[PDB]
Each structure stands twice: as structure tokens, then as C-alpha cells.
Amino acid sequence: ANRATSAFLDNPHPVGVNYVDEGSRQFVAVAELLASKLIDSSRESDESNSDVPFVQAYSKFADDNPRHLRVKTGGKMANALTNVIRSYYSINAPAIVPQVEIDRLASKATVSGDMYNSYAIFNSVPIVEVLSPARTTVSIVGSDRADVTMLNTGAGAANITFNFGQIAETVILKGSVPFQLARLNQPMPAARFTYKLRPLDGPFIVVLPVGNPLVISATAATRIQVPLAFNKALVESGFQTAMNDGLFDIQNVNYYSSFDEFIISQYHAQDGINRVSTCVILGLALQAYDQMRRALPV
């Protein structure tokens, strides 16, 4: 038999284990709150044609009054935020921020470090394995929308078994032409365009008739506990900025096209629950990084 896998689920590198205490989670939450206020002040500064609102926001964030000759990097908070993002990604990235610096920056605002009081839906579709018989070709393309192309060159119909993992909550399959799908040892139903499946049910068998190729489009949705301040649009923008700014350039690390792939791949791995907990904190850090960098380009 031949097995096929989604590209992004292969070999997830270990995540960092350093800044996960109660104080560190408070610092990340404080950075998100203060960076959001900074970007709001910059908009207000432009509207009112005065730099006074921005100066107040920058002083709170950077612990220093902005100076025209200086470059406005963000102060100690920006440097600390950049280093924790590096440490969160990989276990080989050193932790260079002292704990006394984290505690001092955590006291700038009063916020709870509760990272598990809300939820967010992630759209990366996990295809753990697709097993096909001989004389059949199966190709998997896509992460947000997985298209599986199957061609049958054998004498008779083939049975292709899909395994979507045990983590995803729902999966919706739509085919180019009607096809029949069922679980292990259930009667095959009539040809039908769209199927809705719960991955916990078990492996699913697709009967592939001989002839024109059949393409199945796969869309999934999984629920991950996140803080209430989480915003997926900001996290995705922050992920690209950090990747472009060379914050994830560490040896023996795997790269991903989106933060959705990173958290899902890290979830279909050994110690998935603990890995996801660190990934959520990284996402909130990237949310603060996106806001702070757009207000203070460098």
C-alpha cells in the first residue's frame, strides 16, 4: 500500500519551555493591552494634528519620553517582547530576558493572565494518513482547503481509507463528482456530493470507481482555548512580520505558512496539549508584536 500525508503535519519541532509561569503570562497580556492603546493613540494623534496623545502612550509603553533624534524602538518592553517570541518558537533559542525584567514590566497594568477563558476556531485540515491500494495515485494539496486527487487505473473499484486524526471537531468533504463514503464496516450509501464527519468516529472508506479522476475538497474546524483578547486577524499579521523580521531563524526548526498550521501541527504531536498551551501564549505575543510594530516601524 501507499500512504500520503499533509505536508505541514510532518516533524513538528519542540517549542520553548521557559516563559510559561504566572508572571510571564501577565507580561504578555500587559504588552497586548499597552500596544493596542499605543496604536489607538497614534490614530488619535493623526486626527488631532498633535503629538501629545502619542507621547503619553509611548511613555507608558517604553518607560521613557520619546526624543526626536532617537529612533523610537519601543524601549525595554519592545526588546523583551522580541526575545520571548524567539524563545517560544524553539527549545534551542536561549532565554536572555531576566525574570526581574519580566516582573517589572508586568506591573505596568493590572490584567489577568488567564489564557484559557475563551476559544478560537482554526481552519487547518489535518490529514494524518491516506492509504491507497496498488495502481492508484493519490496527491494531497492544500492546508486551509485540502484537495485530494485520486486516479484509479486498476481493473475494479478501489477502497481508499482516510484518517483525519482525533483532534479536529468537524470535517466537511465536497467532491467534484458524487461519491460514496462510509466508516469501517458500515453500509455504503448512495452517491452524494457533500459529507459532514466527526473525526473521532474512525477511519473513513471512499470507494473509487474506475474512470475519470475524483477530487475531494476537505475543510476542517478545531477549537483551541485562548484568552479573550485573542484576535486571529492580528495574530496572522504578526506571524508574517516575525517570520519576515528573522525572529524564527534557528537551526533544526520547521517553518509554516500560517499560524493556523503551526498550532494544529504542534497539536497532532507528542505532548500536544502542553505544546498548544505554549503556542497560545506565543500567539498573544505575536498580536502585541503586530500592533507595536505598525505603530513604531523600524
Binding site: G156, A157, N159, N185, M188
Partner: protein, 622 residues
């Protein structure tokens, strides 16, 4: 009080949760009807069977053909104890039922060999169907099977089976063959030859009563294939289940004929219904006495409860028509008071028992009217229930009742029923010998008539294949339910004054080509001796059945006469599924033919296949 434990599919009723159909709906139009209780339906269903019988078999033709048949039987030089004389009225009547009944059973076996032959040819794809389509209904699984084998009579529905039905397989209608026969003439203690001739012209009142309550049941292979495929891991197991069903059917057919010749009246299957039926308070009772069977069934419907009892048909000689109950499904009251309606069943005992098991397990889901209609339609019309889930359930129970692990065993009951029957033949003969004499008793209870296969019977052959002017008539030699020595004779009658007609017998390896020219008289063709296992050694190989083909020119009829050297040959133990898969034979060569027009002098005799090239099984390789 029987818990089978078999898995059964859930049945969705047409009536709904209310358990009553809405007036003027599509569901109420497609609901099953009661063909027995309604007089208009039952009075009709008699008329169609009578028309079907008289169309295929004409009484005037059968009366005319009596003289020629008697001459042919006489020309078969049987022993003094096994001579069959058709000038005796009783013997002629028994021959008419026997010849018609055997022909239908012979045709069924011919189709079964062809279906087995077709299955083996496509063994690779038949295997693919069985394993892959594990989760599917029996009807749907079968429909795929007959489609891929490319066999005739593809349709599995009742209408398709009726349409593609031969003229010879029509069930025999008892009352039709008992028309216009003088019954009950008296000689008044006169032994003169003139008085004896008068006495032989008529029959006794009992035989007339037996004939008026007779109806044969012949099961087509396409219906048989459904219960075989419900559990079929491989194609070989499919073949074995086919043989197990038909061997049991042949055993029951012989028992049915024996009941007519024993000397006792066959009880009638009947239904009891209330004098004035009250809505939501009605009860139906059905008693089925299958003439071709060793067991009976009593089904009672009281409200939403179904109760059945399977009783032995032997030993009920004490003021009752029911023997001991071999299988109990509840309590059945046969003393219920109501009107008495008689019917003739068109299904065997196992089939009727198979449906009543499924109905009991689905009584809650179905409505009372659905239970009545589905049961009556199957029992009287051989119409399978329309509910696909219910139909699939019934074939699962059919398989269990036929397989080795059946709750009731049939070899034991068939053996006892045989012992009971021949014991009653002796008692009836002995009593009649005392009362009226040996000469009269022999007239009314012939000794030669024992069973369908034991008795010396003739089978007319119809031919539709013409090879260069030679019509081909096919007769399947075997299988046999008895061991001993058997003989086969072929009678050929043509319009020409001089004839050149050939015969050919196909074995597993090679075939035997012979030529004869005697016409209008029996001609002895082949001799066999079969051992305790029903297997015959033909030219050095073990066979269970052989193929016989007659080639003629301008033929009008061809008849095959079979007889055993010794009267009342012993019976081989009925074969089962395990012994059918134990040894494997081949029947693929039965389709091979020869061309008598191109036959030369040197090709006759016994020649193996390798003496010929690929094809051309008529001329020898030089």
C-alpha cells in the same frame, strides 16, 4: 419459546407510528392484501392455475397418449414383479401425476447445473462481489450476481420469474387431472374376467379425494440463490448452499408422491376466520399441511401477537391430524370456532417457517394488516414481501433452517416419515386383502409405485436447438437418491419411414457417441450402478450426474424411460452442505455439442477430450 438470537434488521412500516394507514394515500394503495380470506381473490386464483394447467397439459391429449405410453412401458421387459400396466385406471392416474411432477423437478435441476456452471466460469468476479459488498440486502447482492454471470432469467422479482417460466415447470393442478374418471364400480363377488376388466376401469373414492387436494411446489434457482448469499464467504460456499437447498427439496418431492400411493387421504391446508369479524378484535388461524414435506405449520394471529407451532406429519393416527410438536413458538389454539376456508400452499415448509420467524420478530414494528397480507401473499401466491428489510430478514432465517446448525434437523424427520409411509402401505394392503381379495387390492394399491425416483417413470423432452437439421433433446442423468442398478431407455418417433438418430453422453472427461435406428419402440441406451454415496463410476471416474443428448430428424417426440432393477431401492442419506464442499466435480463440459450431419463412421464410441482439438467436439483428430 425459541430464541434464535439471529441478527435482524429494523423494519420501517408503511402504516407509521399510529399503526394504521391514512385513507387515500400512496401507502394504502401499495399495502399487501389478503388473498385467502377474500373470496373474490381466492375464487380467481383457482381459475388462473386451472387455465395455466390446461394450457400446458391437455386432458384430451393425455387420454389419447395413454395407449402409446402403455405399449412403450410393456416393451420395457421388466420383471414379473415390477411390471407397470397402464390399462389399470389407478396405475395410469399415478403415472400422470408422477410424470408431470418429475418433469418439473427435472427441469429445476437442469437450471441449477447451468447456474453452477456459470458461477464457476466467473469465479474471480463472483468472489469480488461476495467479500466487497458484505453490507447489502440479499436481493441487491443477488441482482449483482446474476448480472455478472451473464445467465438467462436475470430478473429476480416475482413478475420476472413468472414471465421467464417454462411450460413444464407449471405446478400440477390436482382437480384437473381427476376429471371425468369413473369412481366406485362394484362387481358383486364376481371373479370372471369380464368383471375384472370392469373393476380395473375405475378408481376408488379415496384416490379421487387425494387428487382434489394435491398441488405441487417447484422452486426456481433464482429464488434459491437469495438465501445462499446471505452468508457466503467464497464462491465454493455459494455453490455448496445451492446444493444443500435443492437436495432437501428433492427429498421432499419424493415424500409428496409417496403420500398419494400409500393408501390414505392427504389432509387439506385451511384457514379459520371468525363468523362475524369485529374491528380490532379479529383472529386468524392458519394450518399448513405441505404435501411435499415431512413437517407442518400452525400459525395463529391474535391481535398484535403471532404464535406458531411446527408439528410432525407422521404418527398422527389417533383422532387428530397433528403429531408431536417439534418446535414451539408459543401457544396455538386449533379448537377456535369460525368459518373454514381451504387453500393450497405454493411454498415449502421451510419457506413458510422462515417467514413466520421474521414476522414474529417484527410484529411490533409492522401492523396487524401487514402481518396478514404478507403471510397470505407468500403462502398462497409465493409472492415475497415488498418490505425489503423484512424480505432480507426472511432469507436469513431461511439459511439457518437449511444449514447444519438449524434448530430442527431434517434427515431424522425425513427418515421417520418414510418409515411411517411404507408401514401404512403394508397396513392398507393387508386390510384390503382381507376385506375384498388380493386381485382387487392389487388393482387399488399397486406395489410398484413407491417414490418419485424409485418408480419407473418417463419424461418427455422438448427440443428447440437444431444443428444442421438435427433437433437436440437434453436429459440430465442423475443425481440419484438411491443406490443399486438403473437403466435408461430412449424412444424416438419421427415422420420419416427410415431414421438415423444418435445419442451422446457427456462425462467429466470425454463423451460417448452412439447410434441407433429403432423407432416407435423403446431402445436401451445406458446402464449404471451407483454406490452407497450416490456416486457412479463412469469409464473410470467418479460422477454424480451425467448429460444425455438425443439428436433426431423431423422428430415429433422423444421420451426417456428410467427404471431400477430391484423394486424399492434403498435411499442414500440426504446430502448436506459439508459433504457437498468436501468433494468437487465439474459440469462445464455439459454444454459441448456435436454435429450428426458431419459425423463419420470412425468418430463413434467413447473418446476423451484430448483426442479432439480446441472446439469441434464431433470430428476426430487425424
Amino acid at each position: 419459546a425459541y430464541s434464535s438470537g439471529l441478527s435482524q434488521n429494523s423494519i420501517i412500516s408503511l402504516t407509521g407510528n399510529d399503526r394504521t394507514v391514512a385513507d387515500g394515500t400512496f401507502n394504502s394503495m401499495i399495502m399487501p392484501r389478503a388473498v385467502i380470506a377474500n373470496e373474490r381473490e381466492h375464487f380467481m386464483k383457482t381459475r388462473i392455475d386451472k387455465i395455466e394447467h390446461d394450457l400446458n397439459r391437455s386432458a384430451k391429449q393425455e387420454m389419447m397418449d395413454r395407449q402409446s405410453l402403455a405399449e412403450d412401458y410393456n416393451a420395457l421387459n421388466l420383471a414379473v414383479g415390477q411390471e407397470i400396466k397402464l390399462d389399470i385406471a389407478t396405475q395410469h392416474q399415478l403415472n400422470r401425476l408422477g410424470s408431470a411432477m418429475y418433469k418439473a423437478d427435472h427441469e429445476r435441476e437442469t437450471e441449477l447445473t447451468d447456474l453452477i456452471n456459470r458461477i464457476r466460469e466467473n469465479e474471480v468476479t463472483v468472489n469480488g462481489i461476495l467479500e466487497n459488498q458484505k453490507a447489502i440486502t440479499a436481493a441487491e447482492r443477488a441482482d449483482l450476481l446474476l448480472e455478472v454471470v451473464a445467465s438467462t432469467a436475470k430478473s429476480v422479482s416475482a413478475a420476472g420469474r413468472a414471465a421467464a417460466d417454462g411450460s413444464g415447470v407449471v405446478p400440477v393442478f390436482g382437480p384437473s387431472v381427476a376429471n371425468g374418471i369413473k369412481v366406485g364400480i362394484d362387481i358383486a363377488d364376481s371373479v370372471a374376467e369380464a368383471a375384472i376388466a370392469v373393476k380395473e376401469s375405475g378408481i376408488i373414492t379415496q384416490l379421487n379425494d387425494v387428487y382434489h387436494a394435491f398441488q405441487s411446489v417447484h422452486v426456481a434457482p433464482n429464488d434459491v440463490i437469495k438465501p445462499a448469499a446471505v452468508v457466503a464467504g467464497t464462491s465454493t460456499e455459494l455453490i455448496g448452499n445451492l446444493q444443500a437447498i435443492y437436495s432437501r427439496l428433492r427429498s421432499h418431492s419424493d415424500i409428496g408422491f409417496k403420500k398419494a400411493t400409500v393408501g390414505d387421504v392427504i389432509p387439506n391446508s385451511y384457514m379459520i376466520k371468525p363468523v362475524n369479524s369485529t374491528e380490532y378484535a379479529s383472529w386468524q388461524l392458519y394450518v399448513i399441511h405441505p404435501v411435499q414435506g415431512s413437517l407442518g405449520l400452525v400459525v395463529q394471529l391474535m391481535g398484535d401477537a403471532l404464535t406458531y407451532n411446527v408439528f410432525a406429519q407422521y404418527g398422527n393416527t389417533s383422532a387428530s391430524e397433528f403429531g408431536k410438536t417439534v418446535l414451539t413458538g408459543g401457544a396455538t389454539n386449533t379448537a377456535l370456532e369460525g368459518t373454514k376456508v381451504k387453500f393450497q400452499t405454493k411454498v415449502t415448509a421451510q419457506q413458510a417457517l422462515a417467514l413466520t420467524m421474521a414476522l414474529k420478530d417484527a410484529a411490533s414494528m409492522l401492523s396487524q394488516g401487514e402481518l396478514i397480507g404478507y403471510f397470505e401473499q407468500y403462502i398462497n401466491l409465493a409472492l415475497e414481501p415488498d418490505n425489503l428489510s423484512l424480505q432480507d430478514n426472511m432469507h436469513k432465517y431461511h439459511h439457518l433452517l437449511t444449514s447444519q446448525n438449524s434448530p430442527i434437523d431434517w434427515n431424522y424427520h425425513d427418515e421417520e416419515m418414510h418409515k411411517w409411509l411404507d408401514s401404512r402401505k403394508t397396513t392398507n394392503y393387508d386390510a384390503m386383502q382381507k376385506k375384498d381379495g388380493t386381485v382387487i387390492a392389487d388393482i387399488h394399491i399397486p406395489k410398484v409405485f413407491n417414490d418419485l425416483r424409485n418408480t419407473t417413470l418417463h419424461c418427455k423432452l422438448e427440443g428447440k436447438q437444431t444443428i444442421a437439421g438435427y433437433t437436440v433433446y437434453e436429459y440430465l442423468i442423475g443425481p440419484w437418491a438411491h443406490y443399486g442398478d438403473i437403466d435408461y431407455s430412449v424412444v424416438v418417433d419421427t415422420l420419416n419411414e427410415e431414421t438415423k438418430w444418435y445419442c451422446e453422453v457427456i462425462g467429466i472427461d470425454g463423451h460417448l457417441l452412439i447410434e441407433k435406428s429403432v423407432q416407435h419402440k423403446p431402445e436401451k441406451i445406458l446402464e449404471l450402478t451407483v454406490n452407497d454415496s450416490g456416486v457412479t463410476s463412469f469409464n473410470g471416474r467418479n460422477h454424480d450426474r451425467l448429460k444425455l443428448k438425443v439428436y433426431v430428424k423431423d422428430s415429433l417426440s422423444v421420451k426417456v424411460f428410467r427404471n431400477w432393477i430391484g423394486i424399492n431401492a434403498p435411499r442414500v442419506k440426504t446430502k448436506m452442505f459439508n459433504d457437498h464442499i468436501g468433494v468437487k466435480y465439474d459440469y462445464s463440459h455439459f454444454d459441448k455439442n456435436i454435429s450428426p450431419a458431419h459425423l463419420t463412421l470412425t468418430d463413434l464410441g467413447w473418446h476423451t477430450w484430448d483426442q479432439y482439438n480446441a472446439g469441434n467436439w464431433t470430428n476426430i483428430k487425424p
